[PDB]
Design an enzyme around this catalytic site. Sequence first.
Site, PDB file in Angstrom:
ATOM      1  N   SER A   1       0.816  -1.199   0.000  1.00 38.04           N
ATOM      2  CA  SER A   1       0.000   0.000   0.000  1.00 38.04           C
ATOM      3  C   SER A   1       0.864   1.270   0.000  1.00 38.04           C
ATOM      4  O   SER A   1       0.336   2.363   0.162  1.00 38.04           O
ATOM      5  CB  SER A   1      -0.941   0.013   1.211  1.00 38.04           C
ATOM      6  N   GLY A   2       2.173   1.150  -0.132  1.00 39.31           N
ATOM      7  CA  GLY A   2       3.028   2.327  -0.298  1.00 39.31           C
ATOM      8  C   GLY A   2       3.681   2.737   1.007  1.00 39.31           C
ATOM      9  O   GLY A   2       3.869   1.913   1.895  1.00 39.31           O
ATOM     10  N   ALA A   3       4.082   3.996   1.105  1.00 37.35           N
ATOM     11  CA  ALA A   3       4.827   4.480   2.264  1.00 37.35           C
ATOM     12  C   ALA A   3       3.921   4.468   3.487  1.00 37.35           C
ATOM     13  O   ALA A   3       2.750   4.803   3.398  1.00 37.35           O
ATOM     14  CB  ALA A   3       5.365   5.882   2.021  1.00 37.35           C
TER      15      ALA A   3
ATOM     16  N   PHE B   1       2.473   5.852   6.631  1.00 41.32           N
ATOM     17  CA  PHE B   1       2.260   7.207   7.136  1.00 41.32           C
ATOM     18  C   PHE B   1       2.650   7.297   8.611  1.00 41.32           C
ATOM     19  O   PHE B   1       3.377   8.209   9.015  1.00 41.32           O
ATOM     20  CB  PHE B   1       0.779   7.605   7.014  1.00 41.32           C
TER      21      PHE B   1
ATOM     22  N   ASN C   1      14.529   8.299  -0.765  1.00 41.50           N
ATOM     23  CA  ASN C   1      13.993   8.135  -2.121  1.00 41.50           C
ATOM     24  C   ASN C   1      15.116   8.077  -3.139  1.00 41.50           C
ATOM     25  O   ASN C   1      15.061   7.242  -4.062  1.00 41.50           O
ATOM     26  CB  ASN C   1      12.981   9.211  -2.474  1.00 41.50           C
TER      27      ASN C   1
ATOM     28  N   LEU D   1       5.171   5.036  -3.823  1.00 46.35           N
ATOM     29  CA  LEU D   1       6.578   4.669  -4.055  1.00 46.35           C
ATOM     30  C   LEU D   1       6.722   3.172  -4.380  1.00 46.35           C
ATOM     31  O   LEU D   1       7.558   2.812  -5.197  1.00 46.35           O
ATOM     32  CB  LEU D   1       7.484   5.066  -2.886  1.00 46.35           C
TER      33      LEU D   1
ATOM     34  N   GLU E   1       7.474  10.378  -8.041  1.00 48.57           N
ATOM     35  CA  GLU E   1       8.543   9.790  -7.244  1.00 48.57           C
ATOM     36  C   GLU E   1       9.000   8.491  -7.850  1.00 48.57           C
ATOM     37  O   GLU E   1       8.315   7.875  -8.659  1.00 48.57           O
ATOM     38  CB  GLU E   1       8.029   9.392  -5.822  1.00 48.57           C
TER      39      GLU E   1
END
Lengths: 257, 257, 257, 254, 254, 254
Positions: free
Chosen positions: B65-67, B69, B91, B116, B148
Amino acid sequence: EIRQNEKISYRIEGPFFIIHLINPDNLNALEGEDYIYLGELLELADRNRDVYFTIIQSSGRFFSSGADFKGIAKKYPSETSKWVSNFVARNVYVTDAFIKHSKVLICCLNGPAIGLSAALVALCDIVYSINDKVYLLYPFANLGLITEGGTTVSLPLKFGTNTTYECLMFNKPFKYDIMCENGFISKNFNMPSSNAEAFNAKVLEELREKVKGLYLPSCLGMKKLLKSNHIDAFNKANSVEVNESLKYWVDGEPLKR
Amino acid sequence: EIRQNEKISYRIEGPFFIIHLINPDNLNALEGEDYIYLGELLELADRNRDVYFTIIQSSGRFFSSGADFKGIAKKYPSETSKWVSNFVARNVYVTDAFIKHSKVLICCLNGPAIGLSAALVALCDIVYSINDKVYLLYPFANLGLITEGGTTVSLPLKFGTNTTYECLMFNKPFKYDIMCENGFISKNFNMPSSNAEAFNAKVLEELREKVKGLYLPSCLGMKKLLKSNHIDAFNKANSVEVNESLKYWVDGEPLKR
Amino acid sequence: EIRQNEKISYRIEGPFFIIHLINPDNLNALEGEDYIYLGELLELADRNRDVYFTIIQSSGRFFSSGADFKGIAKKYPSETSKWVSNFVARNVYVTDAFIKHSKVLICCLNGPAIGLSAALVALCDIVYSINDKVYLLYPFANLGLITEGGTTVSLPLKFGTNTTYECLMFNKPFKYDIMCENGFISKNFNMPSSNAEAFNAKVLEELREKVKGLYLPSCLGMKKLLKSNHIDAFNKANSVEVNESLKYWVDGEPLKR
Amino acid sequence: EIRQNEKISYRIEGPFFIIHLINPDNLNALEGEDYIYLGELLELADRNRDVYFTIIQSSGRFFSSGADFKGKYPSETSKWVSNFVARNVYVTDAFIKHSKVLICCLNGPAIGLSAALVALCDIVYSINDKVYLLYPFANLGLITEGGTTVSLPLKFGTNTTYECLMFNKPFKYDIMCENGFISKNFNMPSSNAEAFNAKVLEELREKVKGLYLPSCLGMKKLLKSNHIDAFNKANSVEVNESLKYWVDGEPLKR
Amino acid sequence: EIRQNEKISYRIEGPFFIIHLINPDNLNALEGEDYIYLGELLELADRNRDVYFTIIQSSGRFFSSGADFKGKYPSETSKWVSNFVARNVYVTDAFIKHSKVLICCLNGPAIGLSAALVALCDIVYSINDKVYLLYPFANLGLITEGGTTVSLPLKFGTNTTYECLMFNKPFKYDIMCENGFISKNFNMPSSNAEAFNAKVLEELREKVKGLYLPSCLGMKKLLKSNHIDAFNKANSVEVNESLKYWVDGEPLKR
Amino acid sequence: EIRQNEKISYRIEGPFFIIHLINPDNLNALEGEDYIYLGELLELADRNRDVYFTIIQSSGRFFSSGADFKGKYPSETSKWVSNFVARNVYVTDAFIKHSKVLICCLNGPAIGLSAALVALCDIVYSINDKVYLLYPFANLGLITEGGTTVSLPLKFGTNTTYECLMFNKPFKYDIMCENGFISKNFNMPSSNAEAFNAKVLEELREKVKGLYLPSCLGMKKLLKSNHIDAFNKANSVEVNESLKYWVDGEPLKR
């Protein structure tokens, strides 16, 4: 402010700068000064801090049948001087206005586009179609001309190299199925061909919905990066295209066709 | 050797270096230090002379699900210093680790990827899907960020420019049909969405068969040449992307979203 | 004038320079000197002011099964000197002849193409197929070689990067469906596989019709601009490809396979 | 072949196409239509199969003082597209793409667009050490023109180019020498550009003896490929980015 | 606007944004957070619509002796990503992209990353002929940093750059002069950087009189496009390729 | 490891791979198979993990007078592909891609393809001020070779390169010096190349003390990326465009 042009109007609605080709009786054929006027409208949109999207819409059955031949007219010390002023100047300017534009450029394709007008369509970021009868035609080989409006780069980029050769070398259209297979059209609205006005309104309605909740400066920041992929290639092509066309005009072959 | 990471495992089987995202309860969301750890694993694979393929696999219903939080935490003399250390550094490093990797990089897409993580998927050489419900989402416009992980280059390269604009500008997914129409997915395994484990094993089984009789140094020699087509564009984009994002973080808009 | 070659003929019909591979009993496998002869024929076409299109046609069931192995023979002070003369020289020359050719290059694909021959097919501007059973195979990984004939650039350009990796890394064909989905084939003639002769005639008949009314110098002027998009990338790849292959030949691995 | 122009003559002598700026009373200042005429002459030379060298020569004390400021449209943009953009993109492109060896006989200073064309030549010979090139864009409220974006850093170095362009300072003889911009200084009096011009041609005649002239063109064709993309990109961007400076009005005021 | 930093001050005087390194007792050696602070100051100058020139000045006998070697992580890689990669990519990018004219007042030698930043400036003025730039990467067990991969060959030539970098030799005053790296040598005593700094500003004030300053920025914007892609590519590659040198440990040992 | 060649020897001393042209009676003129042998030696050096520097040294009064003109095919094209194209593309590529620091000890003049290889070296040392490089392509009816399309403008400037190449003039010592092509002139008599060669190696030994040699290679790897694409493109285009000059027959006549 800017002068009025009876063939092209504009207005601003929130974050949208809307340009409208409004000469359906002549299939929105454009003269040299109208291409320049389009560049000037892009400059207005580009400098307006409240504008995030520049939307180009047209009228009637054609998006635009391309450059208006009737133009001709009748003053210049040579054929070269004449074509530098009438063709080179105008093409290099309007093509650059599209290439450099910082706002998201959206084309509402209400019908076919031809020639320089169809080049400008290929420079837009996003294209929506009225229905599956749209096409783009670049009739350079039949007119005795070469690529214009950055098509040297945009057509292979967006349609593939082999397809581009078949279409350009033999004066064949980029039809709807080719546009679809290459993802050139982001949405087909499937509306009757007489309904450009309703089509145009429907696109703007959907755009109003789609931008809700987005941070619009992100759209511009992403475009700024994406544009850097091909900006050098487009700027090189623009200069070369306009200068290499001169021998075709000065030779006289296009005047015959 | 390398430290253990409870969210990401690895192992080597013959010519395959296998990386496994093993945190399905949190949809394999990754913190900054986990992206760095991924880069370190790529470095291990890259230096191992017996490794020819680096395979990235995940678990559960999402690829990632990405970075993550939650990260945030609570030490830095300015907001700029903080984001340089937490966002820019990480990054630029993990994106470079993917861009430069010399082994054939294969992604086993067991579900959706976001942000990302989805950028890293687009940097892989070959992608296999579990079924037709996979998608990639790059929610930058909704988060108040920009491109990104090399997406500035990879998305237009692999999906086309016009499609990329529609998806990025309006926060829309690159769905399975778009992936298929652009040849992004090399094989769809058509397995149930609960079956990531069986999917992962099946990909490795087929890979074992496919490499029989090949001269594996040819694979690497060909990759070395193919990578040269876009390596400059990727390295330029990486630097620009990470540095241009800083104003979005320092402005504060992403923290709000 | 030029020497006769029993395996390759040529003739000129109006604006068409026609090259014909005429060794169907050996699947039009080509030796090193035949690739050189192809380059020399391209040079003839390129210098002939009446020629606008160079059409490559073949015979029997294969377009070409690629480089003729039997060649070998039995004189050179080292293995390096031998491969520089036999492989590097020939590849760099024939690949350059295709890359730089100024006339519109059309390939009539009567069956499969393999290896260096299939590379040359991918360098053509337009490709027509006899039917849906055609394919291209680049068996470098099985032969212990790397990319040749500009395939480093042409395959990702015309088929996409991810597809190219799956095909090249695993020695899989670019089949008809992949060619179609990427617009590689401009027209499929849907004729029986035994009918190369009729296929070849039909392509030339349609070409005669398609050029009516066109200003043929426009075709060449447009090609000159279009070629500038990737010419640098092709010239760089050609040099690197031929020089990087030497270690694979000198190591000896391809001789084993 | 081409119309006459009272300010610019041309002739062919063997492999040399010789262009001569012949208006020394006005320091060979050029109007827009004269820059277009120069492009047309380059096209003539470029297409002439007997020509291998295009030599540009001038008269009097200046090579050229630049655009002549002494020298119908629905807007200011339309006007400047027709008068500035069109002409600059065309003459700059004519120089960039020219396939013959381009030699400039620098009989005195050059300014502005004329000095940009000097920097596009392949070889430059000077009459004496009093020559200079001036690009007065910062004082005029303009930007780089005629490919100077590329040519000045390429031929004079980046740091030098910034000092000269940002502060409206000349590229003087010593700077030209130190960068090898001038291939030979003839050290002749400024009162006789005619003798200088004849001497350059005499030495060129000697230097070409025994050479295969198609090799010169074949080598130029390859050398040009090093920066041709950069020059073409710069040409489109320079002419279009100038428009805001003209349409603003700031140059008219200066 | 920004935090204070005891080692670096700034002020604005008309069109000049003046950054002053003010730690002459430690030769203006900079820690990682100071390079970050320099990037933040460049961002301030870049966004300030009244600023046209960013002037970097120092104090004492050195311009800057480079990174201060006197100046929580799950691995060595994580540590070096945070301490070296992050900081170098950010400050180098700040210089590469800066839209205002960047002028360096070189009051004495510069070393290492500080000397890389000097090579990124548009114009460099020297106090006297004792200045030099040293890039001691080969002696430290490191590689090129701060865009030197591109800037050194561009401004000093390729062969010269190899002799200096491969063998840890300085780019001395004579080499700077011969390549036009220094636009003016003020020939003042090293004991008074303050007077040098004031004199440079006085001459800048004179030189800008009568110029349209937006032309300066418009020209820089075009000139920057010649090498911007190369610099951005070099920045990512330099910072990432250094990691193996830091993680190996060889620089810690030197 | 490799066959013997009576005209070219090699040896390894510590981090130095030393190639020695040892045919001073014929001015070290090289045949096609000798250029191939040079490429093979560069491959040996490139693959040898103990080697950091590849040093090319010669003998007698010339570094090398170029291709030896004293030194089965179905056509003229086939012949020239095998004899000229193959050999030039291979040896030029060997120089372009070489990962070790390439140093040339210039004991006297170099001509033609040999002089192209000198211009591909990273560092050049001269015996004395009598050295020159000559590229006689215009007199021979040929075009640029060995990457000179790129290297000459890069290292000598564009305008200088045109004067020298178009008119078959040498790049003399003063031009080499003014462009920083020569990193050190040893000012030794031409009658003893052997002493020159030994002195260069002695000074190299001193200069490498205390350096981390992998940094040298890491820096070269980055520096090479500035122009590697241009060199590779030039190599393919140069060799293929020469064919019309050979097949025409004009070089055979000269």
